Design a protein around this ligand. Structure first.
Ligand SMILES: *[C@@H]1O[C@H](CO)[C@@H](O)[C@H](O)[C@H]1NC(C)=O
Ligand SMILES: *[C@@H]1O[C@H](CO)[C@@H](O)[C@H](O)[C@H]1NC(C)=O
Ligand SMILES: *[C@@H]1O[C@H](CO)[C@@H](O)[C@H](O)[C@H]1NC(C)=O
Lengths: 48, 96
């Protein structure tokens, strides 16, 4: 629902979504789109 | 602390360090190798998504925080067991 929206807000007002009470599935973060940039800074992108 | 030899203007990315290893490192064992960490089940060999270089830059600059400064660390290992020795300090040679 957060990765398949239609009205992504402009940068001057960045919409914020709060994430809680789940189990974090992370294969969706991989299979979704061919992607263009996957720069991770503080957390290992595979040890997440 | 050594901020005068591991730092220069425009940065210095000479040093290296490893974060991606297949297993833990045994004591006093060197694992110098350039092998891309396997993730998922792909035999992928290279850089990019799901194929990461095992070792990342240890980039140093003269202007960092104290915890990010280029600390020079030298460890000393001693073996004091029942065997002929090699190294000592001050020594007197009173006869037996
Ligand atoms: C977004 O949702 C619609 C239906 O809700 C679906 O058909 C579409 O495939 C989704 N977008 C992507 C990129 O999968
Ligand atoms: C994001 O947009 C939705 C729909 O316009 C809105 O209901 C929500 O409050 C927004 N989130 C913000 C502004 O943090
Ligand atoms: C020495 O080689 C063995 C066999 O390949 C390997 O399991 C071990 O980790 C190596 N030890 C060092 C010093 O890397």
């Amino acid at each position: 629902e957060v990765f398949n929206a239609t009205r992504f807000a402009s940068v001057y007002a960045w919409n914020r979504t709060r994430i809680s009470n789940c189990v974090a599935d992370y294969s969706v973060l991989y299979n979704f789109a061919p992607f263009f940039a996957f720069k991770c800074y503080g957390v290992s992108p595979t040890k997440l | 602390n050594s901020n005068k030899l591991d730092s220069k203007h425009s940065g210095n990315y000479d040093y290296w360090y490893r974060l991606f290893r297949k297993s833990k490192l045994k004591p006093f064992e060197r694992d110098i190798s350039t092998e891309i960490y396997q993730a998922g089940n792909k035999p992928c060999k290279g850089k990019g998504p799901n194929c990461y270089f095992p070792l990342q830059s240890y980039g140093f600059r003269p202007t960092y925080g104290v915890g990010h400064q280029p600390y020079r660390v030298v460890v000393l290992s001693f073996e004091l067991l029942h065997a002929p020795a090699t190294v000592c300090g001050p020594k007197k040679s009173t006869n037996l």
